[PDB]
Design a protein around this ligand. Structure first.
Ligand SMILES: COCCOc1cccc2ccc(-c3nc(CC(=O)NCC(=O)O)cs3)cc12
Length: 325
């Protein structure tokens, strides 16, 4: 019974039955780049396989999706900085990574972003990284804390970029409405043609605002739920669990509190409902969450305390199972 090492900042994507886990870092360096960990949501068993081909660099903060058991990976932070390279791994059939020579203007090199999937489009939003190579659609805001501790300052963007998998070509939609502020470590979830985004870090706040981009018309909408809302946070997970509900777990507050609360957002009612679960002593940030075909949300990895104090950080290899349906 092999078991993967603890990590935060990894990626995890799922087909509803199997959950693929790649990358991340820990304390006590990056997790090995060639490994792909497969967790069976039914048997609860892990399996490690080695990948070949254009293996991506070891990274934290990468953004990944699974569409029809093809894995796509964008962005991240490796030993020499952020990237905007795009990879594909076909898991349908030893697995081979392919780095894609994309057409069009790619996003700026960045990590800690999110993605929506809608038909042939991968739609990426926000994140943290270098100044863009062009005045492209959207805004970018420097993080002044990066001016004095590195050789290349970095900041937050509110960019929306489309990767069209019919041609592997980058574009940007002309949107209407008020886009969210630039941010990183937000969480994105897709239901129907609505690409939701909750929270994230921007300047001196970790936020609790909720927006959605209509992925057909490209109109931004801010959602203002009535009643109690979850505390503002970054590094939380947000997962669709039905055509009407999003599941929220964990994260990190403005004043640096690890979180163990869970909520469901009822889309039809525009209302948050706090979710009762047995992991109140297991806060997690920079974990991943994947929904199963069996009505559960599978959380893996992440950190139980303030990961910014790297020498004390408590990175986890635990699986937390939330029974949402
Ligand atoms: C040496 O520095 C102190 C130790 O830093 C660190 C140690 C270990 C892991 C780290 C991961 C990320 C970051 C940073 N991310 C940002 C941009 C952002 O939006 N983050 C989300 C948020 O802040 O909620 C600015 S720094 C720092 C880390």
């Amino acid at each position: 019974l092999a078991c993967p090492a603890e990590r935060s900042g990894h990626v995890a994507v799922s087909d509803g039955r199997h959950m693929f886990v790649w990358g991340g870092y820990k304390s006590n360096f990056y997790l090995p780049r060639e490994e792909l960990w497969i967790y069976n949501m039914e048997t609860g068993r892990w399996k490690k396989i080695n990948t070949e081909g254009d293996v991506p660099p070891s990274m934290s903060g990468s953004c990944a999706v699974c569409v029809d058991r093809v894995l796509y990976l964008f962005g991240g932070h490796h030993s020499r900085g952020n990237t905007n390279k795009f990879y594909m791994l076909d898991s349908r059939s030893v697995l081979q990574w392919e780095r894609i020579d994309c057409q069009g203007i790619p996003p700026s090199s960045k990590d800690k972003l999110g993605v929506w999937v809608y038909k042939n489009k991968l739609i990426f939003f926000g994140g943290y990284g270098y100044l863009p190579e062009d005045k492209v659609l959207g805004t970018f805001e420097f993080d002044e804390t990066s001016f004095w501790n590195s050789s290349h300052p970095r900041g937050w963007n509110d960019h929306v970029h489309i990767l069209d998998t019919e041609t592997f070509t980058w574009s940007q939609p002309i949107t209407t409405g008020k886009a969210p502020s630039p941010r990183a470590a937000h969480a994105c979830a897709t239901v129907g043609n609505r690409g939701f985004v909750f929270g994230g870090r921007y300047r001196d706040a970790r936020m609790n605002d909720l927006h959605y981009l209509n992925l057909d018309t490209w109109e931004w909408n801010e959602l203002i739920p009535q009643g109690i809302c979850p505390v503002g946070r970054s590094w939380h997970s947000l997962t669709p669990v039905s055509s009407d509900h999003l599941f929220l777990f964990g994260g990190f507050t403005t004043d640096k509190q690890p979180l163990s609360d869970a909520w469901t957002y009822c889309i039809s009612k525009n209302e948050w409902i706090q979710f009762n679960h047995p992991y109140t002593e297991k806060p997690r940030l920079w974990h991943t969450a994947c929904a199963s075909d069996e009505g559960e949300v599978i959380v893996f990895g992440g950190c139980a305390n303030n990961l910014l104090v790297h020498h004390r950080a408590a990175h986890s290899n635990e699986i937390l199972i939330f029974s949402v349906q």
